Amino acid sequence: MKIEEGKLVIWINGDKGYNGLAEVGKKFEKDTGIKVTVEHPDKLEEKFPQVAATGDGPDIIFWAHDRFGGYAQSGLLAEITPAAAFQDKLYPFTWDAVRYNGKLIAYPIAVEALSLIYNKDLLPNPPKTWEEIPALDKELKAKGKSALMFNLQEPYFTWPLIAADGGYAFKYAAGKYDIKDVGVDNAGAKAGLTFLVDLIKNKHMNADTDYSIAEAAFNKGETAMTINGPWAWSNIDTSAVNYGVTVLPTFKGQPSKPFVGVLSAGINAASPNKELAKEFLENYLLTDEGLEAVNKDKPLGAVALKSYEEELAKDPRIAATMENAQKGEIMPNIPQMSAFWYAVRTAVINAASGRQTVDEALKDAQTAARAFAAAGSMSSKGLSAVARTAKFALSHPLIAAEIGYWIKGSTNISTNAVRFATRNDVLSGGDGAESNAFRHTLWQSYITNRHGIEIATSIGNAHEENPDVNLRNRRFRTQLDADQTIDLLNNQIGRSLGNTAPIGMRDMALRVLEVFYRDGLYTAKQSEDGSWYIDRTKITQEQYNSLKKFYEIANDFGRSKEEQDEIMKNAAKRDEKLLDEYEKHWHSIR
């Protein structure tokens, strides 16, 4: 029998006290006669999905709730229908962690959350608000002791501050998660990350702090506060640093919202012992006696059962973990969280380091997070042009600042190329024309010349919706289809021209003009029947001499001396008019 009827097989991980479970299973055999065998295979997170689909799994699983959402999406978990009396015996917020499609899919067993850990360096009135942390810093800075230190590289530790004023991963309602509503780049999230970066700017915290660096500083007494979970209590314990666990600080009067991970017990949909499994979990495991047996083998932290939680809350550390969990955000059980972790991790690092602004980092994060949420893949294939451009900014923040977008009067690479191509309207205007060809070729040429071929092909292909279009075809039904291949081909000739020793925009603009005159650049043309064909088009010698003369009198911005001197003197007027106004306050010679 793929799953033997008349006995229960339980799969739990090896770090959660698998021997206490079997003792509860012993009492089950004593009173019922149904054998309970507890096994702890490795790769249990990945073993069950394969065996369940073919129907060869275990009867019961113990694992975190975040993975169970994908299981039910594969139809591998049976619906849990508890009675009202038993359902009220467990904390209501724990049931919301095991709900998919509005239907209960598992039993909550335990709860885990991030919490604040302090030292006698500040034991008294530990900070209750995030806003007073910078003030206490100096106080200890004097004693030459840091104030707060927690890991900043991983978003799991930085999310509680970001989410407080309004921030989430995916919206939750009626037991369902909406993959199209993400909480990055909202007003509260921007405020939360801005406070984090402002602490770094004011040198209350260093952005390169690791998990190990934060752990070492607190264990050695060098920092008064750290943010971490119950897994690190053992290493701190050993260290005589006198540590207590309390509430996470409040931001803007609203509590921090750490991600909450609830240990859950599910039932295989292929198990013929569903009713026997429910009796074991409801009447034996999720009791004060049964949970104590598991608690003794491994501490199990805070517990969903209110009766045992109130007993376990006598330890202030466990009570604080439950309190932060109740104030926190249940980590979504949908598999689309893979998008959230990738986008948020890079955005937070870029903003904290200063390589990217908070608003731009979160905007690119939300753009990328929603994109990967669809297509269910961390792969970029088939994504939109906007998504890949945002992904490019997260991966290469500083370079994306230099490769800007068209802004009137800006001196970035993207706008300077437009100034070269649109000089005196010499080049033909419009999509699929001479001006567009010169822009793309010069734009790719300079990026290649200063950053490399692979950085240029990434940004060039990102701006195109389908960068893998067969370039052999030259006939297109729509001009938009034609212009896509025109840009792809003209990007290639630009990268070849740019793989040289570094030069300026002006001298690189001369190269594109030379090739445009003698070799030509791709341009769209409409034949009869409405179809569009593309071929390399040479430029008239006038156009060539007109632009070359102006290019030879210009800087690397695309402007002549007169055009630059107008702006420089205009800015001098603005700069010096303010100076004269300031000279009113302190009476000067002028």
In whole angstroms, give the CA distance from residue 438 to residue 455: 20
Instruction: Order the strands of the 532-537 sheet from edge to edge.
Output: 475-476, 532-537, 521-526
Q: Are 241 and 219 in contact (CB under 8 A)?
A: yes
Structure tokens at 539: 């430029």
* 107, amino acid identity: Y
423's CB contacts (< 8 A; 6+ apart) are: 547, 550, 551, 558
Q: Is the dihedral of CA 265, 269, 273, 279 positive or negative?
A: positive
Pairing of strands 7-11, 35-39: parallel
Residue whose token pair is 């402007």: 559
Integer CA distances (angstroms), 155 to 216, 343, 366, 402, in order = 20, 10, 14, 27
Obtained via which technique?
Answer: X-ray
Cα angle 390-391-397, degrees, rounded to a multiple of 5: 80
Q: What is d(CA 384, CA 389) in angstroms, rounded to the nearest whole number?
A: 9
Backbone angles phi, psi at 369, to 5 degrees: -65, -45
Token pair for 187: 């007003």
Nearest to 530 by CA among 481, 589, 477: 477
Burial tier of 408 (Cβ tally within 10 Å: 0-12, 13-18, 19+): exposed
Q: How many CA atoms lie within 13 A of 7 on its CB side?
A: 11
Residue pointed to by tokens 């038993």:
86
Task: Tell me the C-alpha distance between 40 and 105, whole Å.
Answer: 21
Could you tell me where the DSSP H helices lie in 170-263?
187-201, 211-219, 233-238
d(CA 212, CA 509): 50
Based on the number of CB atoms within 10 Å of its own CB, is 306 exposed (0-12), middle (13-18) or buried (19 or more)?
A: middle
Q: To which residue do tokens 């998990």 refer? A: 211
Nearest to 74 by CA among 266, 263, 275, 264: 266
The Cα 374–Cα 179 span in angstroms is: 8
Q: Please state, in angstroms and rounded to a whole number, the distance separating the CA atoms of residues 259 and 155.
A: 10
What's the maximum distance between 2 C-alpha atoms anywhere in the chain?
103
Is residue 110 within a helix (H) or strand (E), and if so which, with residue range? Answer: strand 106-112
Report the C-alpha gap between 103 and 85 in whole angstroms: 18
**Four-CA torsion 108, 110, 116, 119, nearest 10 degrees:** 170
Pairing of strands 60-64, 259-267: antiparallel
Three-state DSSP class for residue 123 = coil
Q: By the 8 A CB rule, do 415 and 407 touch?
A: yes
In sequence order, the 6+-apart residues with CB closer than 8 A to the CB of 301 are 110, 111, 112, 230, 318, 321
Residue where the block lists tokens 């899919």: 105
CA of 256: how far to CAs of 132, 146, 159, 249, in Å?
Answer: 15, 22, 8, 7
Q: What are phi and psi of 17, to 5 degrees?
A: 80, 65
What is the DSSP-derived secondary structure letter of residue 308? Answer: H
CB 62 within 8 A of CB 11: yes
Resolution (A): 2.7
Q: What are phi and psi of 508, to 5 degrees?
A: -70, -35
- Judge whether 453 and 376 are in contact, CB under 8 Å: no
Which residues touch 246 (CB under 8 Å, ≥6 apart)? 115, 116, 118, 126, 316, 320
Per-residue HEC secondary structure of 402-428 comes to HCCCCCCCCCCHHHHHHHHHCHHHCCC
Residues present in the chain in total: 590
Name the token pair of 349: 């690092």
Quote the CA–CA distance of 590 and 586 in Å, as a whole number: 11
